[PDB]
PDB file of C-alpha atoms in Angstrom:
ATOM      1  CA  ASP Z   1     -52.891 122.580  -6.678  1.00 33.26           C
ATOM      2  CA  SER Z   2     -54.249 119.052  -6.375  1.00 34.06           C
ATOM      3  CA  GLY Z   3     -53.333 115.530  -5.337  1.00 35.07           C
ATOM      4  CA  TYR Z   4     -52.248 114.626  -8.868  1.00 39.47           C
ATOM      5  CA  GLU Z   5     -48.794 116.140  -8.354  1.00 38.51           C
ATOM      6  CA  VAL Z   6     -48.005 112.410  -8.153  1.00 35.51           C
ATOM      7  CA  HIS Z   7     -48.385 112.686 -11.920  1.00 35.26           C
ATOM      8  CA  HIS Z   8     -45.747 115.406 -11.837  1.00 35.10           C
ATOM      9  CA  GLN Z   9     -43.518 112.484 -11.011  1.00 32.63           C
ATOM     10  CA  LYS Z  10     -44.923 111.033 -14.245  1.00 32.51           C
ATOM     11  CA  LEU Z  11     -43.038 113.638 -16.299  1.00 33.94           C
ATOM     12  CA  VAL Z  12     -39.477 112.949 -17.602  1.00 35.23           C
ATOM     13  CA  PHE Z  13     -39.139 110.458 -14.744  1.00 35.15           C
ATOM     14  CA  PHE Z  14     -41.374 107.803 -16.402  1.00 33.03           C
ATOM     15  CA  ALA Z  15     -40.856 105.165 -19.136  1.00 35.16           C
ATOM     16  CA  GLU Z  16     -42.931 101.935 -19.305  1.00 32.39           C
ATOM     17  CA  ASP Z  17     -45.814 100.569 -21.442  1.00 32.64           C
ATOM     18  CA  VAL Z  18     -47.877  97.367 -21.872  1.00 31.87           C
ATOM     19  CA  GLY Z  19     -51.333  96.955 -23.392  1.00 33.26           C
ATOM     20  CA  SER Z  20     -53.951  94.888 -25.233  1.00 33.32           C
ATOM     21  CA  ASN Z  21     -57.065  96.261 -26.975  1.00 31.25           C
ATOM     22  CA  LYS Z  22     -59.175  96.331 -30.188  1.00 29.50           C
ATOM     23  CA  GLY Z  23     -62.063  94.020 -29.284  1.00 28.18           C
ATOM     24  CA  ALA Z  24     -64.833  96.536 -29.972  1.00 31.46           C
ATOM     25  CA  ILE Z  25     -63.605  97.243 -33.496  1.00 31.21           C
ATOM     26  CA  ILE Z  26     -63.782  93.467 -34.024  1.00 31.15           C
ATOM     27  CA  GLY Z  27     -67.485  93.805 -33.333  1.00 31.79           C
ATOM     28  CA  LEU Z  28     -67.529  96.947 -35.460  1.00 31.31           C
ATOM     29  CA  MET Z  29     -66.039  94.894 -38.279  1.00 30.09           C
ATOM     30  CA  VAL Z  30     -68.363  92.012 -37.609  1.00 30.31           C
ATOM     31  CA  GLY Z  31     -70.689  95.021 -37.771  1.00 29.66           C
ATOM     32  CA  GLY Z  32     -68.894  96.097 -40.925  1.00 30.86           C
ATOM     33  CA  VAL Z  33     -71.602  94.296 -42.889  1.00 29.74           C
ATOM     34  CA  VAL Z  34     -74.694  96.245 -41.674  1.00 27.00           C
ATOM     35  CA  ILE Z  35     -74.649  99.743 -40.180  1.00 27.72           C
ATOM     36  CA  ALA Z  36     -77.734 101.360 -41.730  1.00 27.99           C
TER      37      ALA Z  36
ATOM     38  CA  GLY X  20     -46.126  78.658 -18.802  1.00 34.12           C
ATOM     39  CA  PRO X  21     -42.904  76.735 -18.159  1.00 35.27           C
ATOM     40  CA  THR X  22     -43.870  74.730 -15.101  1.00 33.71           C
ATOM     41  CA  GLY X  23     -40.995  73.777 -12.848  1.00 37.23           C
ATOM     42  CA  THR X  24     -38.152  75.189 -14.909  1.00 38.83           C
ATOM     43  CA  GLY X  25     -38.034  77.941 -17.487  1.00 36.58           C
ATOM     44  CA  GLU X  26     -36.841  81.414 -18.321  1.00 35.82           C
ATOM     45  CA  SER X  27     -39.916  83.564 -18.908  1.00 35.32           C
ATOM     46  CA  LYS X  28     -38.894  86.336 -16.495  1.00 31.57           C
ATOM     47  CA  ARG X  29     -35.186  85.737 -17.260  1.00 29.24           C
ATOM     48  CA  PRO X  30     -34.252  84.619 -13.715  1.00 30.35           C
ATOM     49  CA  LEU X  31     -30.550  83.799 -14.351  1.00 30.24           C
ATOM     50  CA  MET X  32     -28.343  83.906 -17.479  1.00 29.26           C
ATOM     51  CA  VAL X  33     -25.002  85.705 -17.187  1.00 29.15           C
ATOM     52  CA  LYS X  34     -21.203  85.417 -17.321  1.00 28.20           C
ATOM     53  CA  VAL X  35     -19.558  85.248 -13.875  1.00 24.24           C
ATOM     54  CA  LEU X  36     -16.009  85.671 -12.557  1.00 21.96           C
ATOM     55  CA  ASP X  37     -14.590  84.233  -9.312  1.00 24.65           C
ATOM     56  CA  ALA X  38     -12.516  86.041  -6.691  1.00 21.16           C
ATOM     57  CA  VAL X  39     -10.225  83.118  -5.879  1.00 17.71           C
ATOM     58  CA  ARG X  40     -10.771  80.932  -8.961  1.00 17.54           C
ATOM     59  CA  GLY X  41     -11.089  83.555 -11.719  1.00 15.93           C
ATOM     60  CA  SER X  42     -13.797  81.494 -13.395  1.00 18.44           C
ATOM     61  CA  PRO X  43     -17.602  81.352 -13.662  1.00 18.97           C
ATOM     62  CA  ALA X  44     -19.447  80.005 -10.640  1.00 17.45           C
ATOM     63  CA  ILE X  45     -18.945  76.292 -11.249  1.00 17.14           C
ATOM     64  CA  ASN X  46     -21.667  74.120  -9.661  1.00 14.99           C
ATOM     65  CA  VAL X  47     -22.488  76.379  -6.743  1.00 17.32           C
ATOM     66  CA  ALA X  48     -24.448  74.615  -4.045  1.00 20.85           C
ATOM     67  CA  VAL X  49     -27.113  77.181  -3.233  1.00 20.98           C
ATOM     68  CA  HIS X  50     -28.675  78.330   0.029  1.00 20.72           C
ATOM     69  CA  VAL X  51     -31.314  81.007  -0.559  1.00 22.35           C
ATOM     70  CA  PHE X  52     -31.528  83.720   2.093  1.00 25.35           C
ATOM     71  CA  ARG X  53     -34.284  86.254   2.771  1.00 29.85           C
ATOM     72  CA  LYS X  54     -33.784  89.808   4.044  1.00 27.27           C
ATOM     73  CA  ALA X  55     -35.825  90.652   7.146  1.00 30.19           C
ATOM     74  CA  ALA X  56     -36.444  93.983   8.889  1.00 30.83           C
ATOM     75  CA  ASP X  57     -33.836  93.296  11.598  1.00 30.01           C
ATOM     76  CA  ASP X  58     -31.334  92.733   8.748  1.00 31.78           C
ATOM     77  CA  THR X  59     -30.764  88.992   9.322  1.00 31.01           C
ATOM     78  CA  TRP X  60     -31.409  86.277   6.754  1.00 32.76           C
ATOM     79  CA  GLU X  61     -32.648  82.666   6.974  1.00 34.79           C
ATOM     80  CA  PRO X  62     -31.940  79.722   4.622  1.00 34.09           C
ATOM     81  CA  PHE X  63     -34.599  78.434   2.202  1.00 35.60           C
ATOM     82  CA  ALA X  64     -33.516  75.374   0.172  1.00 34.56           C
ATOM     83  CA  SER X  65     -30.643  73.549  -1.524  1.00 30.20           C
ATOM     84  CA  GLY X  66     -29.341  72.962  -5.027  1.00 31.43           C
ATOM     85  CA  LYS X  67     -26.244  73.080  -7.227  1.00 29.11           C
ATOM     86  CA  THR X  68     -25.705  75.537 -10.090  1.00 29.06           C
ATOM     87  CA  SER X  69     -24.260  75.129 -13.561  1.00 30.53           C
ATOM     88  CA  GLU X  70     -20.689  75.937 -14.563  1.00 28.21           C
ATOM     89  CA  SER X  71     -21.835  79.517 -15.255  1.00 30.70           C
ATOM     90  CA  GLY X  72     -23.593  79.840 -11.899  1.00 30.03           C
ATOM     91  CA  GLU X  73     -27.088  79.034 -13.105  1.00 31.13           C
ATOM     92  CA  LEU X  74     -29.590  77.103 -10.975  1.00 30.34           C
ATOM     93  CA  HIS X  75     -33.271  76.884 -11.853  1.00 31.87           C
ATOM     94  CA  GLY X  76     -36.304  74.899 -10.819  1.00 31.85           C
ATOM     95  CA  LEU X  77     -35.998  74.904  -7.041  1.00 33.13           C
ATOM     96  CA  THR X  78     -39.796  75.203  -7.042  1.00 32.51           C
ATOM     97  CA  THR X  79     -42.411  75.631  -9.790  1.00 33.73           C
ATOM     98  CA  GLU X  80     -41.872  78.936 -11.594  1.00 32.18           C
ATOM     99  CA  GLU X  81     -45.383  80.378 -11.268  1.00 35.43           C
ATOM    100  CA  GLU X  82     -46.707  78.350  -8.312  1.00 37.31           C
ATOM    101  CA  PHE X  83     -43.877  79.835  -6.221  1.00 38.07           C
ATOM    102  CA  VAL X  84     -45.435  82.906  -4.645  1.00 38.09           C
ATOM    103  CA  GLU X  85     -43.400  86.095  -4.962  1.00 38.85           C
ATOM    104  CA  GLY X  86     -41.561  87.765  -2.111  1.00 36.33           C
ATOM    105  CA  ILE X  87     -38.123  88.391  -0.660  1.00 36.14           C
ATOM    106  CA  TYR X  88     -36.466  85.460  -2.418  1.00 35.70           C
ATOM    107  CA  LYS X  89     -33.278  84.931  -4.304  1.00 36.93           C
ATOM    108  CA  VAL X  90     -31.043  82.748  -6.434  1.00 34.78           C
ATOM    109  CA  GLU X  91     -27.981  83.208  -4.239  1.00 34.30           C
ATOM    110  CA  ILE X  92     -24.458  82.080  -5.076  1.00 35.87           C
ATOM    111  CA  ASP X  93     -23.940  81.157  -1.410  1.00 34.93           C
ATOM    112  CA  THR X  94     -20.471  81.137   0.103  1.00 31.49           C
ATOM    113  CA  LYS X  95     -21.397  78.948   3.069  1.00 32.31           C
ATOM    114  CA  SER X  96     -22.660  75.838   1.284  1.00 30.83           C
ATOM    115  CA  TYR X  97     -20.658  75.986  -1.947  1.00 33.93           C
ATOM    116  CA  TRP X  98     -17.224  76.486  -0.405  1.00 30.52           C
ATOM    117  CA  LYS X  99     -18.040  73.728   2.100  1.00 32.59           C
ATOM    118  CA  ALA X 100     -17.831  71.317  -0.851  1.00 30.25           C
ATOM    119  CA  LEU X 101     -14.224  72.477  -1.382  1.00 32.92           C
ATOM    120  CA  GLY X 102     -13.305  72.156   2.301  1.00 32.53           C
ATOM    121  CA  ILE X 103     -12.401  75.807   2.950  1.00 36.75           C
ATOM    122  CA  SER X 104     -14.062  77.817   5.710  1.00 36.04           C
ATOM    123  CA  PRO X 105     -16.598  80.474   4.626  1.00 38.22           C
ATOM    124  CA  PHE X 106     -17.932  83.393   6.652  1.00 39.85           C
ATOM    125  CA  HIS X 107     -20.829  84.901   4.692  1.00 38.88           C
ATOM    126  CA  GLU X 108     -23.743  82.544   5.012  1.00 45.99           C
ATOM    127  CA  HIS X 109     -25.482  85.846   4.383  1.00 40.73           C
ATOM    128  CA  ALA X 110     -24.540  89.516   4.561  1.00 38.27           C
ATOM    129  CA  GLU X 111     -26.532  92.196   6.361  1.00 37.70           C
ATOM    130  CA  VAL X 112     -26.496  94.792   3.560  1.00 37.07           C
ATOM    131  CA  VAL X 113     -29.220  97.140   2.306  1.00 33.93           C
ATOM    132  CA  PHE X 114     -30.711  96.875  -1.175  1.00 34.08           C
ATOM    133  CA  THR X 115     -33.211  99.149  -2.896  1.00 35.20           C
ATOM    134  CA  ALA X 116     -35.422  98.512  -5.932  1.00 33.11           C
ATOM    135  CA  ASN X 117     -38.762  99.257  -7.627  1.00 37.64           C
ATOM    136  CA  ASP X 118     -39.354 102.988  -7.483  1.00 34.98           C
ATOM    137  CA  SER X 119     -41.283 103.173 -10.768  1.00 35.28           C
ATOM    138  CA  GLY X 120     -41.254  99.654 -12.186  1.00 38.01           C
ATOM    139  CA  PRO X 121     -39.420  96.324 -12.068  1.00 38.82           C
ATOM    140  CA  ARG X 122     -36.315  95.406 -14.059  1.00 37.36           C
ATOM    141  CA  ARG X 123     -34.280  92.221 -14.554  1.00 36.31           C
ATOM    142  CA  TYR X 124     -31.185  91.831 -12.414  1.00 34.37           C
ATOM    143  CA  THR X 125     -30.980  88.912  -9.976  1.00 35.80           C
ATOM    144  CA  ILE X 126     -28.301  88.585  -7.282  1.00 37.33           C
ATOM    145  CA  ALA X 127     -25.546  86.377  -8.692  1.00 35.73           C
ATOM    146  CA  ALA X 128     -23.101  86.633  -5.831  1.00 33.27           C
ATOM    147  CA  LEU X 129     -19.319  87.050  -5.884  1.00 34.22           C
ATOM    148  CA  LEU X 130     -17.685  83.726  -5.281  1.00 36.27           C
ATOM    149  CA  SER X 131     -15.295  84.579  -2.515  1.00 35.28           C
ATOM    150  CA  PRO X 132     -14.804  82.051   0.302  1.00 33.85           C
ATOM    151  CA  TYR X 133     -15.556  84.232   3.324  1.00 35.45           C
ATOM    152  CA  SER X 134     -17.673  86.864   1.603  1.00 37.33           C
ATOM    153  CA  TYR X 135     -19.761  87.870  -1.376  1.00 39.90           C
ATOM    154  CA  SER X 136     -20.513  90.940  -3.398  1.00 37.37           C
ATOM    155  CA  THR X 137     -22.675  90.578  -6.502  1.00 34.89           C
ATOM    156  CA  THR X 138     -21.026  89.518  -9.774  1.00 38.02           C
ATOM    157  CA  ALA X 139     -22.807  89.664 -13.142  1.00 37.89           C
ATOM    158  CA  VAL X 140     -22.303  91.016 -16.661  1.00 36.86           C
ATOM    159  CA  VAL X 141     -24.761  93.917 -16.585  1.00 32.30           C
ATOM    160  CA  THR X 142     -27.621  94.175 -19.099  1.00 35.18           C
ATOM    161  CA  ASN X 143     -29.657  97.244 -20.173  1.00 31.86           C
ATOM    162  CA  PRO X 144     -33.422  97.723 -19.587  1.00 34.73           C
ATOM    163  CA  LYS X 145     -34.801  95.330 -22.193  1.00 32.13           C
ATOM    164  CA  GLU X 146     -38.002  93.330 -22.562  1.00 35.53           C
TER     165      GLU X 146
ATOM    166  CA  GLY H  29     -96.495 108.729  -1.380  1.00 36.40           C
ATOM    167  CA  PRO H  30     -95.080 108.248   2.122  1.00 35.24           C
ATOM    168  CA  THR H  31     -94.125 111.800   3.000  1.00 35.37           C
ATOM    169  CA  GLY H  32     -91.304 112.123   5.487  1.00 33.31           C
ATOM    170  CA  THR H  33     -90.759 108.452   6.223  1.00 33.85           C
ATOM    171  CA  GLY H  34     -91.505 105.343   4.220  1.00 33.24           C
ATOM    172  CA  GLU H  35     -90.089 102.439   2.285  1.00 31.26           C
ATOM    173  CA  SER H  36     -91.292 102.765  -1.303  1.00 31.15           C
ATOM    174  CA  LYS H  37     -87.833 102.460  -2.880  1.00 32.17           C
ATOM    175  CA  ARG H  38     -86.674 100.126  -0.069  1.00 32.01           C
ATOM    176  CA  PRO H  39     -83.990 102.496   1.296  1.00 31.42           C
ATOM    177  CA  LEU H  40     -82.828 100.357   4.274  1.00 31.40           C
ATOM    178  CA  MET H  41     -83.941  96.962   5.652  1.00 31.59           C
ATOM    179  CA  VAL H  42     -81.221  94.391   6.340  1.00 32.08           C
ATOM    180  CA  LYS H  43     -79.419  92.275   8.950  1.00 32.48           C
ATOM    181  CA  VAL H  44     -76.046  93.717  10.026  1.00 33.27           C
ATOM    182  CA  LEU H  45     -73.009  92.373  11.889  1.00 30.74           C
ATOM    183  CA  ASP H  46     -70.419  94.419  13.816  1.00 31.43           C
ATOM    184  CA  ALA H  47     -66.635  94.118  13.643  1.00 28.02           C
ATOM    185  CA  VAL H  48     -65.993  94.759  17.335  1.00 31.08           C
ATOM    186  CA  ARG H  49     -69.461  94.064  18.772  1.00 34.14           C
ATOM    187  CA  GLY H  50     -70.624  91.146  16.601  1.00 33.86           C
ATOM    188  CA  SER H  51     -74.143  92.560  16.550  1.00 35.89           C
ATOM    189  CA  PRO H  52     -76.422  94.618  14.280  1.00 40.89           C
ATOM    190  CA  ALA H  53     -75.696  98.330  14.096  1.00 39.32           C
ATOM    191  CA  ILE H  54     -77.381  99.422  17.316  1.00 40.52           C
ATOM    192  CA  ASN H  55     -78.523 103.077  17.259  1.00 43.48           C
ATOM    193  CA  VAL H  56     -75.874 104.404  14.912  1.00 43.20           C
ATOM    194  CA  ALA H  57     -75.618 108.167  14.989  1.00 41.22           C
ATOM    195  CA  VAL H  58     -75.393 108.994  11.299  1.00 44.36           C
ATOM    196  CA  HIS H  59     -73.330 111.508   9.342  1.00 45.49           C
ATOM    197  CA  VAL H  60     -74.089 111.332   5.618  1.00 42.98           C
ATOM    198  CA  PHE H  61     -71.132 111.919   3.304  1.00 41.01           C
ATOM    199  CA  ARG H  62     -71.069 112.723  -0.414  1.00 37.76           C
ATOM    200  CA  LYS H  63     -68.420 111.580  -2.898  1.00 38.35           C
ATOM    201  CA  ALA H  64     -66.854 114.407  -4.915  1.00 37.56           C
ATOM    202  CA  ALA H  65     -64.539 114.320  -7.940  1.00 36.19           C
ATOM    203  CA  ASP H  66     -61.414 114.972  -5.838  1.00 36.69           C
ATOM    204  CA  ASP H  67     -62.434 111.916  -3.758  1.00 34.49           C
ATOM    205  CA  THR H  68     -63.214 113.771  -0.503  1.00 32.80           C
ATOM    206  CA  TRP H  69     -66.565 113.730   1.271  1.00 35.28           C
ATOM    207  CA  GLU H  70     -68.518 116.318   3.299  1.00 31.64           C
ATOM    208  CA  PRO H  71     -71.083 115.760   6.096  1.00 33.57           C
ATOM    209  CA  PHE H  72     -74.818 116.280   5.492  1.00 33.11           C
ATOM    210  CA  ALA H  73     -76.990 115.780   8.605  1.00 33.87           C
ATOM    211  CA  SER H  74     -77.463 113.889  11.869  1.00 32.91           C
ATOM    212  CA  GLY H  75     -79.617 111.094  13.232  1.00 32.07           C
ATOM    213  CA  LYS H  76     -79.563 107.806  15.139  1.00 33.21           C
ATOM    214  CA  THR H  77     -80.415 104.409  13.635  1.00 34.02           C
ATOM    215  CA  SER H  78     -82.396 101.467  14.946  1.00 34.40           C
ATOM    216  CA  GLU H  79     -80.920  98.377  16.583  1.00 34.84           C
ATOM    217  CA  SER H  80     -80.598  96.848  13.095  1.00 33.91           C
ATOM    218  CA  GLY H  81     -78.903  99.932  11.657  1.00 33.85           C
ATOM    219  CA  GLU H  82     -81.983 101.506  10.123  1.00 35.12           C
ATOM    220  CA  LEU H  83     -82.507 105.280  10.003  1.00 36.93           C
ATOM    221  CA  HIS H  84     -85.205 106.894   7.886  1.00 39.70           C
ATOM    222  CA  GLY H  85     -86.847 110.266   7.503  1.00 39.71           C
ATOM    223  CA  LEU H  86     -83.869 112.609   7.597  1.00 41.56           C
ATOM    224  CA  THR H  87     -85.768 114.628   4.982  1.00 44.10           C
ATOM    225  CA  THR H  88     -89.031 114.080   3.079  1.00 46.86           C
ATOM    226  CA  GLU H  89     -88.754 110.980   0.889  1.00 47.57           C
ATOM    227  CA  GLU H  90     -89.793 112.505  -2.444  1.00 48.25           C
ATOM    228  CA  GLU H  91     -89.116 116.205  -1.770  1.00 51.29           C
ATOM    229  CA  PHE H  92     -85.454 115.273  -1.204  1.00 52.82           C
ATOM    230  CA  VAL H  93     -83.869 115.736  -4.612  1.00 54.57           C
ATOM    231  CA  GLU H  94     -81.736 112.835  -5.811  1.00 55.59           C
ATOM    232  CA  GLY H  95     -77.960 112.886  -6.029  1.00 54.94           C
ATOM    233  CA  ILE H  96     -74.802 111.594  -4.398  1.00 55.11           C
ATOM    234  CA  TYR H  97     -76.413 110.887  -1.033  1.00 53.78           C
ATOM    235  CA  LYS H  98     -76.338 108.067   1.426  1.00 51.46           C
ATOM    236  CA  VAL H  99     -77.618 106.423   4.581  1.00 52.45           C
ATOM    237  CA  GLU H 100     -74.169 105.923   6.088  1.00 50.31           C
ATOM    238  CA  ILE H 101     -73.376 103.899   9.196  1.00 47.94           C
ATOM    239  CA  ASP H 102     -70.744 106.493  10.148  1.00 48.49           C
ATOM    240  CA  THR H 103     -67.783 105.535  12.301  1.00 50.38           C
ATOM    241  CA  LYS H 104     -66.950 109.092  13.349  1.00 52.11           C
ATOM    242  CA  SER H 105     -70.206 110.115  15.023  1.00 52.35           C
ATOM    243  CA  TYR H 106     -71.488 106.749  16.246  1.00 51.38           C
ATOM    244  CA  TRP H 107     -68.313 105.581  17.970  1.00 51.80           C
ATOM    245  CA  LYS H 108     -67.995 109.043  19.542  1.00 49.17           C
ATOM    246  CA  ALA H 109     -71.055 108.113  21.625  1.00 44.27           C
ATOM    247  CA  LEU H 110     -69.066 105.147  22.997  1.00 39.94           C
ATOM    248  CA  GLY H 111     -65.964 107.235  23.729  1.00 38.66           C
ATOM    249  CA  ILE H 112     -63.527 105.398  21.438  1.00 37.80           C
ATOM    250  CA  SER H 113     -61.542 107.219  18.762  1.00 38.22           C
ATOM    251  CA  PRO H 114     -62.624 106.664  15.131  1.00 38.40           C
ATOM    252  CA  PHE H 115     -60.645 107.374  11.970  1.00 38.71           C
ATOM    253  CA  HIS H 116     -63.036 106.991   9.030  1.00 38.99           C
ATOM    254  CA  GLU H 117     -65.297 109.997   9.029  1.00 38.83           C
ATOM    255  CA  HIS H 118     -65.356 108.980   5.382  1.00 37.71           C
ATOM    256  CA  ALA H 119     -63.240 106.801   3.113  1.00 35.53           C
ATOM    257  CA  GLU H 120     -61.876 107.847  -0.269  1.00 35.09           C
ATOM    258  CA  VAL H 121     -62.895 104.711  -2.196  1.00 35.88           C
ATOM    259  CA  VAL H 122     -64.328 104.298  -5.701  1.00 33.89           C
ATOM    260  CA  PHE H 123     -67.821 102.953  -6.342  1.00 31.29           C
ATOM    261  CA  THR H 124     -69.513 102.137  -9.636  1.00 34.00           C
ATOM    262  CA  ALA H 125     -73.205 101.678 -10.449  1.00 35.82           C
ATOM    263  CA  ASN H 126     -75.941 102.093 -13.081  1.00 35.78           C
ATOM    264  CA  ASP H 127     -74.642 100.732 -16.361  1.00 34.29           C
ATOM    265  CA  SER H 128     -78.038  99.551 -17.632  1.00 36.17           C
ATOM    266  CA  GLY H 129     -80.500 100.280 -14.838  1.00 36.60           C
ATOM    267  CA  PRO H 130     -80.783 100.914 -11.098  1.00 39.56           C
ATOM    268  CA  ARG H 131     -80.987  98.259  -8.386  1.00 41.91           C
ATOM    269  CA  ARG H 132     -81.558  98.300  -4.618  1.00 44.83           C
ATOM    270  CA  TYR H 133     -78.478  98.151  -2.427  1.00 42.21           C
ATOM    271  CA  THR H 134     -77.733 101.064  -0.089  1.00 43.43           C
ATOM    272  CA  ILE H 135     -74.435 101.491   1.778  1.00 46.07           C
ATOM    273  CA  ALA H 136     -74.913 100.042   5.261  1.00 48.70           C
ATOM    274  CA  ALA H 137     -71.380 100.435   6.522  1.00 49.70           C
ATOM    275  CA  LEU H 138     -69.241  98.044   8.570  1.00 50.39           C
ATOM    276  CA  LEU H 139     -69.265  99.114  12.168  1.00 48.68           C
ATOM    277  CA  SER H 140     -65.592  99.187  12.933  1.00 48.84           C
ATOM    278  CA  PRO H 141     -64.253 102.001  15.136  1.00 45.84           C
ATOM    279  CA  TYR H 142     -61.522 103.397  12.891  1.00 47.20           C
ATOM    280  CA  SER H 143     -62.866 102.191   9.559  1.00 44.29           C
ATOM    281  CA  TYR H 144     -65.787 100.909   7.541  1.00 44.51           C
ATOM    282  CA  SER H 145     -66.453  98.514   4.731  1.00 46.52           C
ATOM    283  CA  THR H 146     -70.060  97.849   3.735  1.00 46.95           C
ATOM    284  CA  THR H 147     -72.048  95.237   5.677  1.00 46.74           C
ATOM    285  CA  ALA H 148     -75.444  93.936   4.532  1.00 46.41           C
ATOM    286  CA  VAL H 149     -77.250  90.652   3.884  1.00 45.91           C
ATOM    287  CA  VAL H 150     -77.329  90.709   0.082  1.00 43.65           C
ATOM    288  CA  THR H 151     -80.616  90.537  -1.848  1.00 43.69           C
ATOM    289  CA  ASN H 152     -81.259  89.506  -5.487  1.00 44.78           C
ATOM    290  CA  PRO H 153     -82.629  91.811  -8.236  1.00 42.03           C
ATOM    291  CA  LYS H 154     -86.270  92.008  -7.171  1.00 41.85           C
ATOM    292  CA  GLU H 155     -89.052  94.546  -7.612  1.00 42.88           C
TER     293      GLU H 155
END
């Protein structure tokens, strides 16, 4: 066992989500011009 | 965002019924009360709602720091404007929230003269 | 270089304040704790600092292999010498370092009886 049985609350008894990402792929698409 | 008055967090928009009037909470003069650990509540400020019980912009929406605060349909100050004696300036009742995340239901109180439960048309978990 | 005791890597030289004494860490008996992946820490050895919180030469400076090790101003063993009850033998807190190169700041802990933050006069990136 471990202390992350708190995440065994995060089974069935969990529903929520918010996020914001995709800044590195912006640089990888600014870097879509030269990769070699 | 909306400084002063706005509805970003949806603070209050609902259909209300009255106990003695059978109508939405028409122009409720508002005293906001705050639950303490010894169950008693203290007044905060003053206002007057809409016909549907809606009062906004007591303070700035985001500059107002969060806490045990309320948009209460207060029996003490509203029913004073009608000249009938109220009893519930506040009510020492328990309330529980926020086990695994916040939702949107604010305490729109039952307009009864001496007392209040909470009256609102209930909405589902929705962003 | 300096075998046993020395200050090649600048392990500890700073001015300290105390939470309950308002002074530098006078003669802190030291228990060194090591952060694990399940957040708990285990003791390493024993000592007693200077008046300014400085303890050196627990092992040989270069023969001591590197790792998750510390010169801790420990609340558990120092405040035992004063007869008051401590609580933080260690503290399960996160710490991050070494993204693009190592610098010189070692954990000189806040002398509080039950707890510790980290107390040191901060120095700039300097070789």
